Structure 1
Amino acid sequence: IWELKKDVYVVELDWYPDAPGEMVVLTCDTPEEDGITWTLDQSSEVLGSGKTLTIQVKEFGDAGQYTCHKGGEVLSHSLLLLHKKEDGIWSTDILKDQKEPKNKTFLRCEAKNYSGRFTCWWLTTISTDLTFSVKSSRGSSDPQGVTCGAATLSAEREYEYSVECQEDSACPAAEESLPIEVMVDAVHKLKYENYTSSFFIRDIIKPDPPKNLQLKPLKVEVSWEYPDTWSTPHSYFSLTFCVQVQKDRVFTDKTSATVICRKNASISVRAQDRYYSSSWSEWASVPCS
């Protein structure tokens, strides 16, 4: 048993039918020593007496909020959650495996730029008594501070959650040597699970689409601009672009190109970091004519 947060504890269990579970000793958080009784959740049935209570934790009926009392008054609360270990593997019931870029990928993160801000999302089918908690750092042995916001619903189609984080002391121009770590606690009823992702910002970069795509006729000159959210100065954080008619494609480092509107009209442009192979932006498109 270890403390997750104030008055909240996690009990790790080898999980299989008729498993004996783990013995735990709870201590009432009080200076008092006499006249204490214990209960669980809503029931008033006294489960035990004394400063401490010994319980066998082997199923979800043994988890929940244990409360000690004296003189009719509540002294403290202790919430016990279960972390299932199934065949030496911690359970991943709560989140859906996205299986990309590899097996056991539950969290996906993206950054629009090198600012040190990024967004992560995960998926679950569960709608019930569901709480997530997100913490982050750069490095594990000597962690540097990262602040995240609250995780909240961002879409329903399968429920998608998102959270925003920002490195406290970012260096957009530096060569990262320690990866960002993202850690997600997930609680469903009394079932505790947790998840992790490790990455360099540079590997999760995906620029916003090209801005203000315009056409100039010539007896069909294409031009566009860097996206507003991209890192500055553009002379340092250079982009490269792919221009497609639809395959009729050209690649350029300029913000303009000349093409021929053969088919019924489709022209599309997308952007990538010029110097490091991260993700392409979504396409920007404008019809010909």
Structure 2
Amino acid sequence: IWELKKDVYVVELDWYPDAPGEMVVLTCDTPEEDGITWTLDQSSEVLGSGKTLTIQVKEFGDAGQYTCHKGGEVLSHSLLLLHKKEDGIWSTDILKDQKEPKNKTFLRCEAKNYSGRFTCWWLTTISTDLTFSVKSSRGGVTCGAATLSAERVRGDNKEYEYSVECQEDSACPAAEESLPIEVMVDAVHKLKYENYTSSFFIRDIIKPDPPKNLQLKPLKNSRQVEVSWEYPDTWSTPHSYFSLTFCVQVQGKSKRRVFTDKTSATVICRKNASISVRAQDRYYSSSWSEWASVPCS
């Protein structure tokens, strides 16, 4: 048993029927010795008396808000959450595996520039009685609260998307990163305690916003057209240091590529086709932005 936060404790259990469990001794945080009584959750049943209470924690029934009373008053609480360890590996019932980069990815982090600011997201089937706590650091990072940012429909069930925004306290955009950023997330659903983590350098999780103000300018006595665009607003300043490279593609009806560092390109439009442009950090091979498109008709 260990303290997660003030008056909240986690008990690590090997998860299988009739597991021995853990002998847990709760001590009431009161200096009074007389008339102490003990209760679990909403039940009125006295489990014992005295300053100490011993329980065998073997299942969720033994977990909960243990309360010590004196003269009808509440003296202290000891909230017991469990951390199930099924077949040698900690449970992951709360968050869905996003499966995107390479399996067992529950936390997905992304940055839009080098400001030291980033966003992490996760998905759950659970709609309430669910709390999250996010902490982050390099190897001084401040994170806001995990907020509900999207609600979707996946088959029979519902999918809730949570996101958190963090900022490195004393960022330095242009500097080389020697130590990666670490995100730690605690997940509590009723009485189930879970643990999640992610390690990355800002440079690797970068994905700029798409090129903006895409324009198509036809040319006289030419089959070709000129497409032009601008750097996105959220991208890092100045562009001279933090430059972007681009890729142009003509997306037609068929489903069976030009690279440039410029904000313009000359291409051939065709009926029913669209011109598409993506961006990548010129100097680091991170994620390509989402497409910005302009149609040919």
Tell me the TM-score range normalised by the shorter chain: over 0.9
Q: Greater shift after overlay, 166-175 or 261-270?
A: 261-270
- Give, in angstroms, the shift of residue 78 of structure 1: 1.1
Deviations 1:51-97 (A, max 9, x none): 11111100111111011111221111111000001121111111112
Cα distance per residue 1:105-148 (max 9 Å; x no partner): 11111110111111111112122411111111110xxxxx1111
SS in 2 for 1:282: coil
SS in 1 for 2:61: helix
Provide the secondary structure at the position in 2 that maps to 1:31.
coil
Post-superposition CA distance 1:211-254 (Å, at most 9, x none)? 11112222122111100000001000010001111289211001
Q: Aligned residues, how many?
A: 284
Flag structure 2 segments of 5+ consecutive residues without an equivalent: 152-157
Of 222-231 and 25-34, more deviation after overlay is shown by 25-34
Distance (Å, rounded) in 2 between the aligned partners of 1:78 and 1:112: 42
Q: Identity of aligned pairs, percent?
A: 99
The match for 2:155 is: none
Task: Give the Cα–Cα distance (whole angstroms) in 2 for the partners of residues 98 and 216 of structure 1.
Answer: 41
- Alignment check: 8 A CA contact 2:271 2:296 kept: no
Tell me if structure 1 keeps the 8 A contact 2:119–2:165.
yes
Moved more, 272-281 or 240-249: 240-249
| 1:253–1:87 CA distance, 2 compared to 1 (3 A) | same
Distance 1:174 1:31 in 2: 54
Match runs of 1:173-252 below 5 Å: 173-219=174-220, 220-246=225-251, 249-252=257-260
Where 1:192 maps in the other structure, the secondary structure is: strand
Partner of 1:275: 283
RMSD, aligned α-carbons: 1.5
Q: Normalising to structure 2: TM-score of the pair?
A: 0.92
Aligned pair in 2 of structure 1 residues 200, 69: CA closer, same or farther (>3 Å)?
same
Aligned position for 1:142: none
TM-score by length of 1: 0.95
Moved more, 95-104 or 130-139: 95-104
Residue 265 of structure 2 aligns to a residue in which SS? strand
Gaps of 5+ in 1: 140-144
What is the Cα deviation at residue 262 of structure 1? Answer: 2.4
Which sits farther off after the overlay, 157-166 or 73-82?
Answer: 157-166
Partners of 2:75 and 2:87 in 1: CA distance: 38
Question: SS where residue 178 of structure 2 aligns?
Answer: coil
Q: SS at 1:259's partner residue? A: strand
- Between the aligned partners of 1:18 and 1:265, the Cα distance in structure 2 is 64
**Displacement of 1:162:** 0.9
Displacement after TM superposition at 1:282 (Å) = 0.4
User: Partners of 2:86 and 2:272 in 1: how far apart?
Assistant: 57
Distance 2:258 2:103 in 1: 35
DSSP 3-state at the match of 2:268:
coil
Runs (4+) off by over 3 Å: none
**Could you say what secondary structure the match of 1:155 adopts?**
strand
